[PDB]
Every structure is written in C-alpha cells, then in structure tokens.
Amino acid sequence: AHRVAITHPGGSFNQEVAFLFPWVYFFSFLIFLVVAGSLAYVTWKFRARPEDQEEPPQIHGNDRLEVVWTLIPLAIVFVLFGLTAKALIQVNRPIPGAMKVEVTGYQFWWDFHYPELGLRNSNELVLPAGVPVELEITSKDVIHSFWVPGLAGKRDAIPGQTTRISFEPKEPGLYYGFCAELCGASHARMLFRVVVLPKEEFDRFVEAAKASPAPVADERGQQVFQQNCAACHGVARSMPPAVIGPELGLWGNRTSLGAGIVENTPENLKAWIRDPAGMKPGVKMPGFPQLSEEDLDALVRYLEGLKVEGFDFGALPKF
Amino acid sequence: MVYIALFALGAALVTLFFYLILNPRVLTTEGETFDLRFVLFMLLLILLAAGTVALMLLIGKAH
C-alpha cells in the first residue's frame, strides 16, 4: 500500500512548508479552547429552569470587550500571514541550475521530456534524489493539474502557457501522482508515478535509455505493432514530430498502465489493448478486439521487451 | 507592496463613492438634477471599479 500524505518529507517542498503546521495547530487549539469552551460554559451555566419567568439582566454589550475580541484575532492573522509570506517566497524561489523537465498534459495522460538529455518518456517520471528539478508544465487541450503529494504541492497545466514548480526530491521511492483539475470523464484515471532513484542509479537509467535502441523481443510482435499501434505510439524514447499517444520505448520499465491506474502485467495489458474504454471512460484510444490471440500475445511480448535492463522500480518504498 | 496598497485604495474609493450616492439621506434629495448626479457617480464608479480590478489582473502577470 502506498503511504500518500501531503506531510511526507519526500521533497524539499514538504520539508520547507512543514513549519506552518505547528503554528496552525497551536492557534486552532487555543481558539477552540476559548471560544468553544465559552459556548459550552454558556449552555451549562445559563440553561433555564422551566418554571423561571423572571427575565435575566438586559445588558446591551461591553465596548471594551469588543475591542479585545477584534484586536486579538487581528494579531493572530498578522502572525499567520507573516509566516505564510515567508514560506511562499521561499518555495517559489527559482533554483539556479536545476534539471529542466517538460511536463505536458493530455486527456487523459502525462508526457515527459528531458530537454538536456534528449529523452522522452510517459506517465512515469524518473528523477534523481538530491538533485533540484524544475518542472515546466503545460497542456495540449483542457486545464489539468500536476500533483505529487508525497513530494510537493500542485501546479495547473494551462493551454497556451507554461507554468513551473521547482523542488528537490530527497527520499527515493515510487510516488503516486494525480491530475488535480477536473478535465473530463477520466479525470480520476489521469494518474502517474514519480520514480525517485539515488542519483547514481538515475544517471544509469538515462544513459542506458539513450545508449541503444529499444530491443525487439518478438518480431511477429514488432510487425503487429507497426500495423496497429505505431501510428499513435513512438518507441524511440525521444520527441516525435507530432505527439499523439504516450511513448512506449520504455514500456517494460513502467510499473503501471493506463496513466497509472492499474499494474503493468501481461494480463492487464491484454485487457487494456482489447478495450481501453472499459478502464477509462472517454479514452481516446480504440480497442482491438479483432486481433488474433496469437498476435496479441506476440504483441505483448514485444511491448514488455521495450526497456532497459537492471532496474526494479516496483521494489522502491511506496509513497 | 505599493500596488497592493493601490488596490486597497481603489476598493476604498469604490466603497466611499457608493456610500456617498446611495445612503438613505442622500436619496431623499429632491430635484430633476439628482438623477443626473446619481448617474454621473455610476459613470465614475465604473471607471474606479474597472481600473481597480484591471490593476490586480496585471499584477497577476507581473512575475
């Protein structure tokens, strides 16, 4: 089970904002004690015995008290605000020399491009621990929002512009990611993973990715892929001239399928290929029910062969 | 900080001019000319409100 929490100190963002929570808890505790306590007292103390017909003392207020219970809350918000501004300024500060990663949202999946590396992957974003990253985010259709709670707050993906968020992953693991802007029928199925590896291991994955082409583990499979899939899917692990579907060149390294909604396994892959819509309402990929069982199996072998060796992302701690 | 204070000032002026023209005492004013007065305040209120909001939208793009 994934231990998803906005308080998890997996990234520099969650570590940097953490100091706000105790202040919130403290003031809220005091405010509750006083105000809720007073109201509790009132209901116990001033209940009226049914026989009582004598009206209580008709007091109209307390001018001094009005001032105190205006200024004290005011002071509290000034403190909260002061802490808030300090924290906001720090987490929005750009980090010089951070590896840029271009994030692009589609209905209903996520595309990733590492411009300095010349590398493309989809739905699972691999990152080095201890290294600052700058996410450059946009959309090709409607508004989306890129959210990895275990690492950092979200930033919207808005068509026609580029938004950004910077942070430094610290703790290696497999992080759940969600789209956090209602984008259509499969909003709840527009997920992803952030794979955080030790820097040394990250440098290896990227090197192997760009070192040689994606293997061909089944030739009958490569042809079936060419006749049915290549039209929408690249396997070259780099930006195609026109993007239609996700990159499949690193498919065999993917822990999840369908933009992170189900485990990547041969059985899940078959079901997906036969009827994507059955898993993602409104999904923009046709099913392939005609394909012979022989072709589908051959196709799955080929797909699962599109990878680099020596990595096991499914063994990372789950966040 | 200067622009935020300018925004606050805008809102205060919008508030003030609404008060000056719409409080119960001023609305009892008689004369065919009050209609013109009332409407010219609205003209000014449009400018004040639009400018105040426009200011903040532009601040939104001033990274």
Binding site: E55, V142, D156, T163, A180 | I4, A50, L57
Partner: protein, 780 residues
C-alpha cells in the same frame, strides 16, 4: 385548480416567500439524494455503481442545485420575502409584481438546469465551476446550465433590488435603519453584495455561452485570449456568493439567540459594522481560488492577506452572538439547538478556511478533499444549520402550526452526528492526498477505503435525518397544535401578527416611537395600547397573471437558446410574446382604487427599485471593462486597421446625449402639468435612441465584414462590450416605449409615473456607459 390560479397570480409577499422556501428546501432534498448516490459510489475503492461521465453529471447537479437553488434562497428569498416586510411593519414589498416575477424566473432556472436530462449529452458534467476550455468543449448539457444561470440572474437581481427598496422605502414610520432587526440588516448586506458582484458570473457565463454558440472567445490562447481570465471573472462573483449565503444566516442566528435567551442583542452596532466589513472584504479575495494557476507571487500574497482579514469581521460577529446568549435564560427549543450546532462547527470551518488562505499549504490542499470538507463544514454544518434554525424558528409563523419539539431535536442530532461522520474523515482524506471530483479511487492507498467508508456511513445517517425532517413537517401540518401569534416570546414585529398573518399583515396601527430594535419589548413596558387599523387605510396590491406569463415566455426564450443553434426563429417568437406580456403588465393598475403613495425617502418604489438594480449594471460593465483593459494593456488585444470610425461614435454620442436632455425636459414638463410637451419629448427621446441603434447596427454590419471575432481578440471584445451596450439601448428604449404607451392611455399622471422615473433613469445610465465605451473602444 382554484389554488393553482391563486398561486400563479399572487403578489402577496408571504405566499411568494412560502413558494421560495418550499422550492429551496425541495432542492436541498433532491441534491441530498444526489449526494447519497455519490457517497454510495465512493463507499469502496474501484466501485462500479456510478462512474465516469454519469458520476460527473450527478456531481455537477449536486453542487449547483445546493448552491444556486437551495442555500442562497432559503434564508434570503424564502424567509426574507415572508419575514422582512413584517419585521419592517409593512403591508407588502416595494415591488409586488416584480417580486412574483422573480419567483417564477427562479422556478424557470431550475427547470432549465434539470431538463438537460432529456437532451443529447444530458446534464452538464463539467463541475459547478465549468472551467474553460473544458466547458467550451463538453458535449454535456452545458448550454442548459448556462441558460439556467442567466435566467436565475434576473431572479436574483430583481429580488435584491426589491429587498433594498423595501428596506429603504417601507420601514414603519419612526423606525430608523438603526432600529431594524439584525436579520433585516443582514438581508440588506447580502442583497447589496449580490447586486454588485453577480457581474463576474454573468460575464463568465455569457462568454462561455457566446463561445459555444457563435465562436466568440475572450479565453482562447490561439488568439491571445487568456483561459485564466475565465476564472478571474467566475470567482469575482463566486467568492462573494458564499458571503451572500452566510450573512442572512448569521442574521438568523442572532435573531434566534436574542429570542431564546430573553436578552437584547449584544453589540448591535458592532454586528452591523461586521456585516459591512464582510461585504467589502468579500469582493477583494476572489483569487484565493486561483493559487495554483501560475499567477505572480505578489498577486498570490495580496490575496492571502485580504483573505485572512475576513476572519476578523466574522469573528466579531460570532462573538457578539455568543455575547447575546451570555447571561440569558436559555430556552432549549429546537431553533436554539441548530444555533449552537452552527457556532461550534463554524469555528473549525472558518479555521480550515484560513488554512486554505495560506498559499504554500493550499498548493497541497487545493482540489483535494480537504477543500471539500472545509466547504461542507461552512455550507452544511454552517449555513445549512442556519437554514434549519430559521425553518423551525419561523415555521409556526409561516404555517400556523406548531411542530413536535421531540422530532425537531431528533432531526438535529441526526444531522449533527451525520455531519461529523461524513466530513471529518474528508479532512483526513485531504491530508492523505485524495483529489476531489474522482468517481473512483484505487485500493492500494492507505487510509482511503476506511475513511471513505466512514464518510458514506455518515451520509446515510444524514439520510435518516432527512426522513425524520420530512415526517416532522408532515405531522406538524396534519395534526399539529394551532400556532399562537408569538409562540417563543419574540420582540420583533413579525410576532405582532397572527399565525399565519392575515393578508394585510397588521390589524393594528403601529406606534411611531422605536427606542430600540425590540419594539414588542419597549411597547409592553410603556403599556402602549395598540389601536385597530382603519380598513379604509388598508390597500392591498392586485393579483396579476403577467409576472408568471413573462417568466414563462422568457423561460421559453432561454430553452430556444440552450437547445438550438443561435440565432433561431423561436428566440424571436418568445421574445415577441415576452414583449407583449410586458406591455400588458405596464398597462395594468397596481391597485383597484386610488391610493396615497408615501415612502420613507419620498422617492417612489419604482425609482428606488431601479436605482438599486442599476448597481448591478455598474458591476457588469465594470468587470467586463476590467477584463478588456487587462487584455489590451498586456498586449493581447490590439485593434485591427478596420476598427469602427471615431466620427461615427461622436455622431452617436450627440444622438444619445441629446436624448438624455429631451427625456430630462420631458420629465420636467410632466412636473409642470404640460402633457403634450411631455408626450413629445418622450417620443423624441425614443426616436433618437432608435437612430443610435440603427447607426450602431450599420457600423456592426460593416465591422463584421472586415474582421472576424474568431481570429482577433480585440474584435471579440468590441462586439462583446459594445454589443452588450447595444442590447441595453434596446431594453432602455423599450422601457421608454412602455412609459409612452402609458401616456397614450392616460396612465401617466402627476400622481402616477413610476415607470417613467425608472425608464428615464435607466436611459441616463445607458447614456453614461456609452461615454466610457466611446473612450476605450473608439478614442483609445
């Protein structure tokens, strides 16, 4: 049938109030059922009960129905229409036919929204917020949702203007604003805030509709439009709306506290100042809904600041409510229970609200169940509890029957317990990173299944509460003990009437001395004996079919707009029928006999109603112009070479300014008894307006042939704002024409000329707005 014809034609504020109230609470029950479908789907991971588009449809209907058809109605248009005139010691509202029209338009809006079910694409599925460009692209019933919002806007604005005119003009002689019940102040504050701010939603709604129907866009990045500008417009109203939803309920809480504590209101002046404070700040915080959209840090910090300030005026209000209870002799009747539930829960609701204002934290909390918990905390356990405090408080007054206290209390505890169990787990879910608006979730995320199951159990407990609530009302109406004039021992004027009140409200003449905001208290001490009213001075507004007919034909106009490509023949057919209806309405006497019209201010109700409605016009043009100024100054919108010529706008300025002078002098003559000169000036004004319109039309035709609003942002802005102004010329022109038809039938006299005062003032406004338009669209 007899009861139907009565309701279709009534102008009695009490019946209108009951209709609003019953409709609003029906809306709550309908949307509550929707919430049960939602929570059933969410009870376990990977559920297949309600999925995808269907879930998003139910979700959208749940939220919009609760916000637009329930919470912002019950405590405002419902209780308010019934109770406010009584509290003011009046016999009706300022504009009884307008008031009825506002109810029927409300019902019309509800029908528009729900009927989407029967059309291709069904109900809207884009969330109540209908974010662009998602809402521009959807096949779902977005058009019906947008039409509904626009139709509803007419109901709200007219209703708000009616409330404020009623408060200014109909207060019992001797009662200054500062002697009114706190609830009236809160209805006052809510109405003013609503009048000014609705503009944001009107703009956002109109612009998405125009885009879907005729391809005119302010938001499309391909022409330099700004998708985020849509959110700026939307939230410019959609924050203020929640304070419009809060103020009346705080007013109710204070009223209930005073009555059931046998104490006067603690810090009455401070309570008013706090509501004023909330109205002002309420319009300066909208962008805290937009923290994650990539606006500058300075912009974000600005909104975090003003948002946190809101906590101060609100606290002061709550503290004063608690002060009202303090030292009292608490009668533990049902309404007081709701009040206590409100206050205890609102503390957490407001606190989490402030947590959300802390921008860094909001980066996490945004679009997660933490937000969902926050707003149900303040809308359900807050306003909602307020609504039920109000329902039980005024139930005897509205129905003439007492309810069973035992059932009332059972309803309360079920809602309390159910509320906690439903929504406390949702705060936790937010901490656990659960996004909102997800029809389903996986099973390999720790905590989610357990917390979601608990939440669903809570929701079913609220369901039970709902059954208990319905039974309670049913039992009360069928076998309940008949209600006395003043069952709780209240001190405000609504308790000086019968239960329910006679048609004319007060059988007695009221004293003209109000030492405080508790007249029943002060008069009883002075032994003031109240004398019966002379039935000769009692005149009730006549029933009329035209408000309903007008709402019906406008409803049909909006159906033709929603369901078909624009424009179409049906739009025109129903607009024509609608115009006909308004002509009959304008020629129909308010009363059967002659009547002495005296108001507190000296200004007619027509004048006063128009002056407050015009506030909404200022708002609408202000927000649209702000958007335009922003797009142009940022370099996005630049005029094409073929822009309409300046000389043509100056000619038009001459026409329009002249028309303001002909109409002014036309009114002047009416004030002198010279009727032919008056008829003539009015007619001249009308002809001048027509000329302005014909000139604009030709200019629009020409400009349309030289520049596409699909390819040029400035052109889109021009047609939008100058076009909208053109529509105003038509409306104002028609208004003047109504007055002229009145003059031709001898309905205009030195005595009665309200329609003329309103139309004239609205015309001057059209003139003023033109001057701003010339400035920013033809000069600049």
């Amino acid at each position: 049938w007899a009861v139907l014809w009565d309701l279709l034609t009534t102008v009695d504020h009490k019946k209108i109030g009951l209709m609003y109230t019953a409709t609003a609470f029906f809306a709550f029950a309908l949307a509550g059922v929707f919430s049960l479908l939602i929570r059933t789907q969410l009870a376990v991971p990977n559920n297949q009960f309600l999925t995808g588009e269907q879930y998003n449809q139910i979700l959208t209907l749940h939220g919009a129905t609760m916000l637009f058809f329930f919470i912002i109605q019950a405590g405002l248009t419902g209780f308010g229409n019934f109770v406010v005139p009584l509290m003011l010691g009046a016999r009706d509202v300022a504009l009884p036919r307008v008031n009825a029209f506002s109810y029927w338009a409300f019902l019309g809006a509800i029908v528009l929204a729900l009927m989407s079910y029967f059309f291709p694409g069904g109900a809207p599925s884009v969330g109540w917020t209908f974010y662009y460009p998602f809402s521009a692209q959807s096949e779902s019933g977005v058009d019906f949702y947008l039409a509904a919002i626009l139709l509803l806007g007419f109901s709200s604005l007219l209703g708000n203007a009616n409330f404020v005119a009623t408060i200014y003009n109909l207060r019992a002689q001797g009662m200054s604003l500062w002697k009114m019940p706190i609830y009236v102040w809160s209805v006052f504050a809510a109405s003013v805030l609503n009048l000014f701010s609705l503009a944001g939603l009107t703009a956002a709604t109109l612009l998405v509709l125009l885009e879907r129907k005729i391809g005119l866009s302010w938001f499309n990045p391909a022409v330099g439009g700004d998708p985020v500008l849509f959110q700026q417009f939307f939230w410019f109203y959609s924050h203020p709306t929640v304070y419009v939803m809060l103020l009346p309920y705080l007013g109710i809480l204070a009223e209930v506290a005073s009555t059931f504590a046998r104490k006067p209101l603690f810090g009455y002046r401070q309570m008013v100042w706090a509501q004023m404070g909330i109205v002002v700040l309420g319009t300066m915080v909208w962008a805290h809904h937009m923290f994650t959209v990539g606006e500058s840090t300075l912009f974000q910090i600005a909104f975090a600041f003003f948002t946190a300030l809101i906590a101060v005026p609100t606290g002061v209000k709550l503290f004063n409510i608690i002060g009202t209870l303090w030292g009292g002799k608490l009668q533990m009747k049902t309404p007081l229970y709701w009040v206590l539930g409100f206050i205890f829960n609102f503390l957490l609701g407001g606190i989490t609200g402030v947590m959300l204002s802390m921008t860094p934290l909001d980066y996490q909390f945004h679009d997660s169940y933490f937000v969902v918990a926050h707003f149900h905390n303040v809308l359900m356990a807050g306003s909602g509890f307020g609504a039920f405090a109000g329902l039980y408080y005024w139930w005897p007054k509205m129905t003439g029957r007492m309810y069973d206290e035992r059932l009332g209390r059972l309803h309360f505890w079920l809602f309390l317990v159910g509320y906690l169990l439903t929504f406390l787990p949702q705060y936790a879910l937010g901490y656990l990173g659960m996004p909102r608006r997800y029809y389903t979730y996986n099973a390999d995320i720790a905590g989610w299944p357990e917390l979601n199951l608990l939440s669903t159990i809570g929701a079913y407990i609220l369901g039970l509460g709902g059954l208990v609530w319905i039974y309670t009302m049913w039992k009360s109406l069928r076998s309940g003990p008949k209600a006395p004039d003043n069952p709780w021992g209240g001190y405000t004027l609504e308790w000086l009437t019968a239960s329910p009140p006679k048609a004319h409200n007060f059988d007695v003449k009221l004293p003209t001395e109000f030492p405080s905001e508790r007249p029943l208290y002060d008069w009883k001490k002075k032994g003031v004996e109240l004398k019966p009213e002379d039935p000769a001075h009692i005149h009730l507004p006549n029933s009329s079919f035209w408000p309903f007919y007008s709402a019906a034909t406008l409803f049909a106009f909006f159906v033709a707009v929603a369901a078909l490509p624009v424009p179409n023949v049906w739009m025109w057919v129903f607009l024509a029928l609608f115009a006909y209806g308004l002509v009959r309405w304008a020629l129909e006497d308010e009363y059967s006999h002659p009547v002495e019209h005296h108001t507190v201010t000296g200004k007619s109700n027509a004048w006063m109603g128009m002056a407050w409605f015009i506030v909404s016009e200022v708002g609408l043009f202000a927000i649209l112009i702000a958007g335009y100024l922003y797009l142009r100054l940022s370099g996005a919108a630049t005029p094409p070479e073929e822009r309409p010529a300046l000389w043509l706008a100056l000619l038009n300025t001459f026409l329009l300014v002249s028309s303001s002078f002909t109409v002014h002098f036309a009114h002047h003559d009416l004030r002198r008894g010279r009727f032919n000169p008056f008829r003539f000036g009015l007619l001249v004004t009308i002809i001048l307006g027509v000329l302005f319109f014909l000139v604009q039309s030709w200019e629009f035709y020409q400009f349309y042939h030289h520049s596409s609003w699909q390819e040029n942002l400035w052109t889109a802005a021009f047609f939008t704002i100058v076009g909208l102004h053109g529509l105003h010329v038509v409306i104002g022109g028609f208004g003047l024409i109504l007055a002229y038809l009145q003059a031709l039938r001898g309905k205009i006299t030195l005595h009665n000329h309200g329609t003329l005062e309103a139309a004239s003032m609205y015309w001057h406004l059209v003139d003023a707005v033109w001057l701003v338009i010339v400035t920013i669209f033809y000069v600049w």
